[PDB]
Swiss-Prot record, chain A:
Requisite cofactors: Zn(2+); [4Fe-4S] cluster
CDD domains according to UniProt: S4 (cd00165)
Stretches assigned to the S4 RNA-binding domain: 98-160
SUPFAM superfamilies: Alpha-L RNA-binding motif (SSF55174)
Matching PROSITE patterns: RIBOSOMAL_S4, S4
Protein name: Small ribosomal subunit protein uS4
Organism (species): Thermus thermophilus (strain ATCC 27634 / DSM 579 / HB8)
Subunit structure as annotated in this protein's UniProt entry: Part of the 30S ribosomal subunit. Contacts protein S5. The interaction surface between S4 and S5 is involved in control of translational fidelity.
UniProtKB/Swiss-Prot annotation, chain C:
CC terms in the record's Gene Ontology section: cytosolic small ribosomal subunit
Annotated S-S bridges: none
PANTHER family attached to this UniProt entry: 40S RIBOSOMAL PROTEIN S11 FAMILY MEMBER, SMALL RIBOSOMAL SUBUNIT PROTEIN US17M
Similarity remark: Belongs to the universal ribosomal protein uS17 family.
Any one biological process term the GO annotation gives: translation
A Gene Ontology molecular function term of the record: rRNA binding
NCBIfam families for this protein: PRK05610.1, uS17_bact
Signal peptide: none
The protein's assembly and partners: Part of the 30S ribosomal subunit. Contacts protein S12.
Source superkingdom: Bacteria
Name the record gives this protein: Small ribosomal subunit protein uS17
Phenotype caused by lack of the gene: Increased generation time and a temperature-sensitive phenotype.
Gene behind the chain: rpsQ
Protein role: One of the primary rRNA binding proteins, it binds directly to 16S rRNA where it helps nucleate assembly of the platform and body of the 30S subunit by bringing together and stabilizing interactions between several different RNA helices. The combined cluster of proteins S8, S12 and S17 appears to hold together the shoulder and platform of the 30S subunit.
UniProtKB/Swiss-Prot annotation, chain D:
Pfam families per the UniProt record, alphabetical: Ribosomal_S8
Family membership: Belongs to the universal ribosomal protein uS8 family.
Gene (UniProt): rpsH
Name of this chain's protein: Small ribosomal subunit protein uS8
Gene Ontology cellular component terms for the protein in this record: ribonucleoprotein complex; ribosome
Gene Ontology MF terms: rRNA binding; structural constituent of ribosome
Organism of origin: Thermus thermophilus (strain ATCC 27634 / DSM 579 / HB8)
PROSITE patterns, A to Z: RIBOSOMAL_S8
Keyword list, A-Z: Ribonucleoprotein, Ribosomal protein, RNA-binding, rRNA-binding
InterPro entries: Ribosomal_uS8, Ribosomal_uS8_CS, Ribosomal_uS8_sf
General function of this protein: One of the primary rRNA binding proteins, it binds directly to 16S rRNA where it helps nucleate assembly of the platform of the 30S subunit central domain. The combined cluster of proteins S8, S12 and S17 appears to hold together the shoulder and platform of the 30S subunit.
Assembly and binders: Part of the 30S ribosomal subunit. Contacts proteins S2, S5 and S12.
GO biological process, one term: translation
UniProt lineage: Bacteria, Thermotogati, Deinococcota, Deinococci, Thermales
UniProtKB/Swiss-Prot annotation, chain E:
Pfam families named among the record's database cross-references: Ribosomal_S16
InterPro entries hit by this protein: Ribosomal_bS16, Ribosomal_bS16_dom_sf
Key words, A-Z: Ribonucleoprotein, Ribosomal protein
Species lineage: Bacteria, Thermotogati, Deinococcota, Deinococci, Thermales
Encoding gene (name): rpsP
UniProt protein name: Small ribosomal subunit protein bS16
RNA sequence: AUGCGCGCUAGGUCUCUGGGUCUCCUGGGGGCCGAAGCUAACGCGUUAAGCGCGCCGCCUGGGGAGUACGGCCGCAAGGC
RNA sequence: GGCUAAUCCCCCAUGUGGACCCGCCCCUUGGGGUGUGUCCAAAGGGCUUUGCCCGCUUCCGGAUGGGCCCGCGUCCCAUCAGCUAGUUGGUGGGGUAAUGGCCCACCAAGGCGACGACGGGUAGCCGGUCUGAGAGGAUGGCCGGCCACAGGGGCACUGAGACACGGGCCCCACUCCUACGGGAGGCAGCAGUUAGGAAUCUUCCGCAAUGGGCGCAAGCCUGACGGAGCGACGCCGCUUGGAGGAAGAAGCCCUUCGGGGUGUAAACUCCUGAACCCGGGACGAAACCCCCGACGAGGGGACUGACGGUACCGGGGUAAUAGCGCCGGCCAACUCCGUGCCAGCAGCCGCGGUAAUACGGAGGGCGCGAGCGUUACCCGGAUUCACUGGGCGUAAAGGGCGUGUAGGCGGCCUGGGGCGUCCCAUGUGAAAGACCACGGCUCAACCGUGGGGGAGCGUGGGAUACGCUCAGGCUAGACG
């Protein structure tokens, strides 16, 4: 159970907008609209200078909450990237960017990531023609990620896609809105995504 | 040391002695209380600390601490020894695990409940 | 290959047998230098031909006695008693080191 | 008797240069000549000459250093910043080719004696041989 | 005597065998003389049988005995074919 | 409270004992200041505590304890 | 005590050949050939019955599995320093598949040890595993290889193989039966019981698969095994919802009484549809066998599931578990109240003697999350046994001083050798694991296929600077 509960609170503690609610994280309600201070009794108090540890921990939490991942999946992913050839930070982001649910979000099929997850687990998504109900599932370049033929007239789906008419998608992605399909073209680099994250801080955090 | 000296004598690997003979290498030992009493602590503090003399399954008699606020232990109650010592006490090398055997848990404790062995209460 | 080594004959004293001292060198697995170690092989001299001080090649063979798995191959150097006297000296040093 | 002649050379050089002496004499051996020749070729000394002190052969090593500097302590950057023995008698060290050190990230050298002669770590690798690791310089 | 037979390398309900020359008295799954082929009964990939008929015919020449199933697979690779 | 041997690294000054064309120079010892350098500092510095090599001895928190036990010395006291 | 068959035992023959003494030849430890002499063979059964099969006997190879021997590696204590009588060798012999004091007789006086013998302590070893940047430390459950044991101690018999776990004999301890003479056992096989313990499972299903024994087969046996069950023990996957929703309800907490907080969190709206119900429903299984062909090759045919109606697919379908540690510093997270050296905390530093972020509750927060903590233990940090990678004037640490034994170390040039060193080739370094890649279960875990690497040791070849050795010079050390 990767974190389930009040969210715009994490937006707040991380000090930046993470967009966990989709639209309305786009409204003037995000609570980063006039409560940009963290949650709790002490949120409005002058904040002491963070320890090196603090800084690093917090950056990592930012990244994780962005993807909505267990710690354990996140660690395993990182380590799996530290093993791989190529810059660890970037590989990591690439691997995170490769979760099916994330691909579904990224393709506009779902509004937020948590929603994308639900869409996957419920089997409204196919990958190359077969249903994949695992959110963790790794999309590989070349993969065609589609809305289920059966889920195609779902209210949430129709609205979500008529949204994406005229919208531009990730430059590592292809989209066909008529067909409710999209292709994962290539792994993204750190410039491809806008993340409010210095990944090198995360490498350091796990380096302790 | 010269290298030749190392080839002759070598370097001495140094062993550590166990802070705990609960023997067995075991994580806990069962025992029976012998004396259940109170004791005054070492030079910097004052209190009345609650302890039991325990006769272990492991053949040893040892003094164990009885953590938490209330306690039910008396001369014949059988108990579990978990090890870890009490610093400002004389010769108390192990703690009693509460909730196990004739040790009750700590009544009314709401806070770190698994230390102290008390169940989660219900709410209203 | 039946293993074959070289040593010097330090013991005359048996019947059709010779004690052959064999040195060997090798690097030390940790401290890295070369160390020199040695052991006495009991070797088969049926002819009673090889004498003390002879530096001989020695060979892996069919077992002769307990302790004799090696027989004398050939003589290489003759009469290095410097070796023998070294070893005898050690054995005399033994008489110290006790009680 | 010097117990290690080769070290005595390396050190003669060390102290020599650490006072900025212009040259220094070391009792001559063909091997020392070789080591020297490597340094010279590598830009570490200026060069050396075979010479005669009281009728005994020495090799005279002429040392180089950097420019003069500013602020307090004008003394010049050494050109041999660091020079040390690796193999010594009484612990002999031999690397095979795959075990040949790279030094100071390539900016330094190691001098190995090999059955192909005395060569720099790069030299030895290119020659594809190993041997007794004599010293490192940088 | 010496056998040509199957040894179980899969996982639970995922059986994959090694076609193997071994002494008869070994554990089924234990140390053998050679791996001649592989066998995947559940035919989960394009190659679910490899043989290497050359070594198979060797071992037959020195009188290894294939088991019944071993020999089926062996012959499937035409180790025994004369033409 | 500084194991032995060897090689290398400014000087100044006082001394003991040789040799030399005897302001002084050149050996071998004893002192004091001091270059570089070392050092936690104090200090050491061609009589190293500097730079290096060889070899020996030794160290691994305090107390318990140079104790106990064992062995070996010793007439004993006591020693190792 | 009596009868009787055989592929049971024996006798005579045949002697392909083989064994043994002796001689010669080749080869070189007992390898191969040859000559005379002596000795040694067999077993029948089935049929689709004049031939084919399943067998038998002797011999030579092969393959596979073993025995024995050797180099090297293999924990702690020297407060264990000497050990040794079959002990060390020799000759002859006994024994064995075979070498061997393995055993015996006779002879000799040896063998081993500070390069740690002897003694004591501990311990199955390994592939590997854990940890570490590495070097190193620690470890050897599961899987694979080896060894050893089968209540304790001895012993042999049968046999290709045992000194045999469900074989035999004896002694011992224990249980059981007994008519007191005497008998019967041996789960460290699967399950299960009991004891011990902090603690470790079902007296399950199946012979369908793979494997094993016997059988020409059909088959039979197989707690090997393939499966299922229980345990959050591990690992991996996944759920407890998704979107909207106030300038932001109640409650609660804090409050400078203005307000701040839990917080879009709830309520509520819409949507999806774990669970669950229905229908379909596997792969793993094609052989052996039968038929043609020739019992071959080849072709054709049939049977066969424990898992299990399981996985999986289709339909329907409900908003559907959250907990545990922590918030003085190390260390991410602060306030109120209670308590007043008490009660309690505590890994160290240290908190509590009326203003306690350190006790106890609450509000709030940080961290992980079907877990979270604790205890024990290993590596880590610990460059705190320092090979990498420490030191000894005053911090722990130079022996009171010498002499020299072993041992370590060795100036300049030349030549031979090529042992150390280095190089090339090759052999070995099983599989599993680790690594990379592709692949198979919807992913992963798990699994398969391929690839790479590699210390060490064996063999052949090569180099010669350095180390050694031999030879020959020199004088800068040393001595005279
Ligand atoms: Mg990386
Ligand atoms: Mg977008
Ligand atoms: Mg791209
Ligand atoms: Mg974004
Ligand atoms: Mg940025
Ligand atoms: Mg790390
Ligand atoms: Mg670390
Ligand atoms: Mg106090
Ligand atoms: Mg009671
Ligand atoms: Mg503890
Ligand atoms: Mg607490
Ligand atoms: Mg003799
Ligand atoms: Mg004999
Ligand atoms: Mg011979
Ligand atoms: Mg003696
Ligand atoms: Mg002594
Ligand atoms: Mg090598
Ligand atoms: Mg076997
Ligand atoms: Mg497939
Ligand atoms: Mg095929
Ligand atoms: Mg054929
Ligand atoms: Mg000068
Ligand atoms: Mg004068
Ligand atoms: Mg003087
Ligand atoms: Mg001074
Ligand atoms: Mg100075
Ligand atoms: Mg120093
Ligand atoms: Mg200073
Ligand atoms: Mg001088
Ligand atoms: Mg002076
Ligand atoms: Mg002096
Ligand atoms: Mg000196
Ligand atoms: Mg010092
Ligand atoms: Mg220490
Ligand atoms: Mg102490
Ligand atoms: Mg005393
Ligand atoms: Mg004692
Ligand atoms: Mg005494
Ligand atoms: Mg004494
Ligand atoms: Mg006495
Ligand atoms: Mg005294
Ligand atoms: Mg009868
Ligand atoms: Mg009758
Ligand atoms: Mg006959
Ligand atoms: Mg004949
Ligand atoms: Mg014979
Ligand atoms: Mg017969
Ligand atoms: Mg007959
Ligand atoms: Mg064999
Ligand atoms: Mg005897
Ligand atoms: Mg005789
Ligand atoms: Mg004999
Ligand atoms: Mg016998
Ligand atoms: Mg036998
Ligand atoms: Mg006899
Ligand atoms: Mg006798
Ligand atoms: Mg030895
Ligand atoms: Mg024992
Ligand atoms: Mg044991
Ligand atoms: Mg051990
Ligand atoms: Mg270490
Ligand atoms: Mg290792
Ligand atoms: Mg071990
Ligand atoms: Mg076990
Ligand atoms: Mg088992
Ligand atoms: Mg095993
Ligand atoms: Mg036994
Ligand atoms: Mg038993
Ligand atoms: Mg017993
Ligand atoms: Mg027995
Ligand atoms: Mg038999
Ligand atoms: Mg046995
Ligand atoms: Mg049994
Ligand atoms: Mg049996
Ligand atoms: Mg009896
Ligand atoms: Mg009974
Ligand atoms: Mg029974
Ligand atoms: Mg019996
Ligand atoms: Mg059992
Ligand atoms: Mg019990
Ligand atoms: Mg089980
Ligand atoms: Mg059954
Ligand atoms: Mg079967
Ligand atoms: Mg079968
Ligand atoms: Mg059969
Ligand atoms: Mg039939
Ligand atoms: Mg029948
Ligand atoms: Mg049965
Ligand atoms: Mg099983
Ligand atoms: Mg349980
Ligand atoms: Mg439980
Ligand atoms: Mg899990
Ligand atoms: Mg709406
Ligand atoms: Mg709206
Ligand atoms: Mg509000
Ligand atoms: Mg409110
Ligand atoms: Mg209120
Ligand atoms: Mg105010
Ligand atoms: Mg309010
Ligand atoms: Mg919500
Ligand atoms: Mg509404
Ligand atoms: Mg549906
Ligand atoms: Mg509905
Ligand atoms: Mg159903
Ligand atoms: Mg089937
Ligand atoms: Mg089929
Ligand atoms: Mg059958
Ligand atoms: Mg037919
Ligand atoms: Mg026919
Ligand atoms: Mg037929
Ligand atoms: Mg056929
Ligand atoms: Mg067929
Ligand atoms: Mg069924
Ligand atoms: Mg069925
Ligand atoms: Mg259907
Ligand atoms: Mg369905
Ligand atoms: Mg709900
Ligand atoms: Mg809802
Ligand atoms: Mg929570
Ligand atoms: Mg503090
Ligand atoms: Mg932490
Ligand atoms: Mg803090
Ligand atoms: Mg009170
Ligand atoms: Mg009060
Ligand atoms: Mg207070
Ligand atoms: Mg106070
Ligand atoms: Mg508090
Ligand atoms: Mg605390
Ligand atoms: Mg508290
Ligand atoms: Mg709370
Ligand atoms: Mg909470
Ligand atoms: Mg745990
Ligand atoms: Mg452990
Ligand atoms: Mg530790
Ligand atoms: Mg380290
Ligand atoms: Mg320590
Ligand atoms: Mg230290
Ligand atoms: Mg060191
Ligand atoms: Mg130190
Ligand atoms: Mg020193
Ligand atoms: Mg002083
Ligand atoms: Mg001191
Ligand atoms: Mg002294
Ligand atoms: Mg001396
Ligand atoms: Mg000497
Ligand atoms: Mg010499
Ligand atoms: Mg030399
Ligand atoms: Mg020498
Ligand atoms: Mg030469
Ligand atoms: Mg060579
Ligand atoms: Mg070559
Ligand atoms: Mg190779
Ligand atoms: Mg091999
Ligand atoms: Mg190799
Ligand atoms: Mg391998
Ligand atoms: Mg794997
Ligand atoms: Mg690797
Ligand atoms: Mg895949
Ligand atoms: Mg490797
Ligand atoms: Mg290896
Ligand atoms: Mg060679
Ligand atoms: Mg040559
Ligand atoms: Mg000479
Ligand atoms: Mg002369
Ligand atoms: Zn937000």
């Amino acid at each position: 159970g990767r974190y389930i509960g009040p969210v715009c609170r994490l937006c707040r503690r991380e000090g930046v907008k993470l967009y966990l609610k989709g639209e309305r994280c786009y409204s003037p309600k995000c609570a980063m609209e006039r409560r940009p201070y963290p949650p709790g009794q002490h949120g409005q108090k002058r904040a002491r200078r963070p320890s090196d540890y603090a800084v690093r921990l917090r950056e990592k939490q930012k990244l994780r909450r962005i993807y909505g991942i267990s710690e354990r999946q996140f660690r395993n992913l990182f380590e799996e990237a530290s093993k791989k050839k190529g810059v660890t930070g970037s590989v990591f982001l690439g691997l995170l960017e490769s979760r099916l649910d994330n691909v579904v979000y990224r393709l506009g099929f779902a509004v937020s990531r948590r929603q994308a997850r639900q869409l996957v687990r419920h089997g409204h998504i196919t990958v190359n023609g077969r249903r994949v109900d695992l959110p963790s599932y790794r999309v590989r370049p070349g993969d065609e990620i589609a809305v289920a033929e059966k889920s195609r007239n779902l209210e949430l789906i129709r609205q979500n896609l008529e949204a994406m008419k005229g919208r531009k998608v990730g430059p590592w992605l292809s989209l066909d809105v008529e067909g409710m399909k999209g292709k994962f073209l290539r792994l993204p680099d750190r410039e491809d995504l806008a993340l409010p994250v210095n990944e090198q801080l995360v490498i350091e955090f796990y380096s302790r | 040391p010269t290298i030749n000296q190392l080839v002759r004598k070598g370097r001495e690997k140094v062993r550590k002695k166990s802070k705990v003979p609960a023997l067995k290498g075991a994580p806990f030992r069962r025992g029976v209380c012998t004396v259940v009493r109170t004791v005054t602590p070492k030079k910097p503090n004052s209190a009345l600390r609650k302890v039991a003399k325990v006769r272990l399954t492991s053949g040893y008699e040892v003094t164990a601490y009885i953590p938490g606020e209330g306690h039910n232990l008396q001369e014949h109650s059988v108990v579990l020894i978990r090890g870890g010592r009490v610093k400002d006490l004389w010769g108390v090398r192990y703690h009693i695990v509460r909730g196990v055997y004739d040790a009750a848990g700590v009544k009314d404790r709401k806070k770190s409940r698994s230390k102290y062995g008390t169940k989660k209460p219900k709410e209203a | 290959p039946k293993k074959v080594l070289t040593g010097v004959v330090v013991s005359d004293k048996m019947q059709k047998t010779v004690t052959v001292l064999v040195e060997r060198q090798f690097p030390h697995p940790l401290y890295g230098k070369v160390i020199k170690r040695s052991k006495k092989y009991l070797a088969h001299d049926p002819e009673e031909k090889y004498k003390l001080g002879d530096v001989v090649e020695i060979i892996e063979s069919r077992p002769i006695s307990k302790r004799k798995r090696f027989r004398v191959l050939r003589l290489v150097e003759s009469g290095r008693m410097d070796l023998v006297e070294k070893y005898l000296i050690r054995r005399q040093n033994y008489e110290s080191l006790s009680k | 008797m010097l117990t290690d002649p080769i070290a005595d050379m390396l050190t003669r050089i060390r102290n020599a240069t650490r006072v900025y002496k212009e040259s220094t004499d070391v009792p001559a051996s063909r091997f020392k000549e070789e080591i020297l020749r490597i340094l010279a070729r590598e830009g570490f000394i200026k060069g050396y000459e075979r010479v005669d002190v009281d009728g005994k052969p020495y090799l005279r090593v002429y040392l180089k250093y950097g420019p003069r500097r500013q602020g307090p302590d004008p003394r010049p950057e050494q050109v041999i910043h660091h020079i040390r023995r690796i193999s010594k008698p009484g612990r002999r060290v031999y690397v095979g080719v795959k075990e040949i050190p790279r030094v100071r990230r390539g900016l330094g050298i190691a001098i190995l004696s090999t059955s192909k002669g005395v060569l720099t770590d790069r030299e030895a690798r290119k020659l594809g041989v190993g041997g007794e690791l004599i010293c490192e310089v940088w | 005597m010496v056998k040509i037979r199957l040894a179980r390398f899969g996982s639970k309900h995922n059986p994959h065998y090694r076609i193997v020359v071994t002494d008869a008295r070994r554990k089924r799954d234990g140390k053998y003389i050679e791996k001649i082929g592989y066998y995947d009964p559940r035919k989960t990939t394009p190659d679910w049988l490899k043989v290497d008929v050359e070594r198979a015919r060797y071992w037959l020449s020195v009188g290894a005995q294939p088991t019944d199933t071993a020999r089926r697979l062996l012959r499937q690779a035409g180790v025994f074919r004369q033409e």
